[PDB]
Structures are given as C-alpha cells and as structure tokens.
Design a protein around this ligand. Structure first.
Ligand SMILES: *C(=O)/C=C/c1ccc(O)cc1
Length: 121
C-alpha cells in the first residue's frame, strides 16, 4: 500500500512496474521535463476517461490536459523542473472533455522525470 502524499512516495513508486502502478489508490502520471507522458496509470484513467495506452507519448500540457496550462499548474511544474526539487501540492478542476471534476494534485520529481499524482476531492 502507498498513500497519496506520502513523504517518500517517489521511493516506493520507483520500485514499481505497470501492474503495481495500475493498482495505486490515486492517479499517477509520469512526465518528462518537456511534459510528455511517460506513464499513466489505470486510476488516473478512472478519473479522467482517458485510455492510458493512448495518451503515452502525448504532451500533457499542450494536448491532453489543456486546462492545466496555467501559472497554477504548468507554471509550478516548470518552476520545479528548473529549480531541481519538484514537490508541490494544490487543488484544481479538470474540465476538458470530461464532467468538471475537483481534484487535488501533488507533483514530485521522480527518484529526470516528474510525477503528477491526482485524487478526487
Ligand atoms: C484539463 O483539461 C485537464 C485535463 C486532464 C487532467 C488530467 C488527465 O489525466 C487528463 C486530462
């Protein structure tokens, strides 16, 4: 088990393959520094209606999740990629090609890549 917001979440998830990541209680996306989607788990698709196989390779901020292109989300992502120590938590609403859904988001650098964790609120 691993809880959303755990202090060493990136350690636990570093040791995980697809099945384990797909088993998480919360949405988990891994992005590269350009915002391209490396991994996208089953729990996230249950929040957003996206097929996890279909969004791998796409750009999260440009194409998949346009509502996240804002100082409040994308702005914080690039600040944390630049500053080297991404680790930030905030509320957000996801509303593109889905019913508007309130979530909380935790972005954290991976053990060169970057996690976006999501849970319904
Ligand atoms: C806003 O358009 C957000 C879209 C979105 C957020 C998270 C996802 O996993 C997919 C789309």
């Amino acid at each position: 088990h691993v809880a959303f917001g755990s202090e060493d979440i990136e350690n636990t998830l570093a040791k995980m393959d697809d099945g384990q990541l797909d088993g998480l209680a919360f949405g988990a996306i891994q992005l590269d520094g350009d915002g391209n989607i490396l991994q996208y788990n089953a729990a996230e698709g249950d929040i957003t209606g996206r097929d996890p196989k279909q969004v791998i390779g796409k750009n999260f901020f440009k194409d998949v999740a346009p509502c996240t292109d804002s100082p409040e989300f994308y702005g914080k992502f690039k600040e944390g990629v630049a500053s080297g120590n991404l680790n930030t938590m905030f509320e957000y609403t996801f509303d593109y090609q889905m019913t508007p859904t309130k979530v909380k988001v935790h972005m954290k650098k991976a053990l060169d890549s970057y996690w976006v964790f999501v849970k319904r609120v």
